[PDB]
Design a protein around this ligand. Structure first.
Ligand SMILES: [Zn+2]
Ligand SMILES: [Zn+2]
Ligand SMILES: [Zn+2]
Ligand SMILES: [Zn+2]
Lengths: 75, 73
DNA sequence: CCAGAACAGAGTGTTCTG
DNA sequence: TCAGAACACTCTGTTCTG
């Protein structure tokens, strides 16, 4: 019943862009799709995305958003 | 061109004992005097280049040290 | 309840000084 | 020579508004 962000594992704010997510991931995603998302992974594109590390790799974070199914169409 | 021994960017000069770029110069100071324990989201193997240096402070900091940067020398 | 705007704070990198 | 201050800009995340 306390429920978890499907992207970083932080506690979720609600349903955003179709996926159970935290507020930071909600706005991160909005920002990534509206703008240029060309991000480079410094790793192997498997970076661990959690509450402390999610700022490290926008590229892996954004890929996790897409895998979870986030999209603007909402509704 | 002589290149930064940390991120490979074009080096401005010799800083904190090592030949490095200026962003690396000020990153290192900031790291050393500020706390911190940085944590890698990878394998402690991150690629550090001009673009990628921003991604992993842990691996950046490590590479600074293994290059011999220190506040004294 | 949710999208988006606003607000405020952290982090990077430059330019400038002596 | 290079260290440091200060500036300017980008990024993240929380609170506010509709
Ligand atoms: Zn999240
Ligand atoms: Zn990554
Ligand atoms: Zn460098
Ligand atoms: Zn790393």
């Amino acid at each position: 019943p306390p429920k978890l962000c499907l992207v970083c594992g932080d506690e979720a704010s609600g349903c955003h862009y179709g996926v159970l997510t935290c507020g930071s991931c909600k706005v991160f995603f909005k920002r990534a799709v509206e703008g240029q998302h060309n991000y480079l992974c410094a790793g192997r594109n498997d970076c661990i995305i959690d509450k402390i590390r999610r700022k490290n790799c926008p590229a892996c974070r954004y890929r996790k958003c897409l895998q979870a199914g986030m999209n603007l169409e909402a509704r």
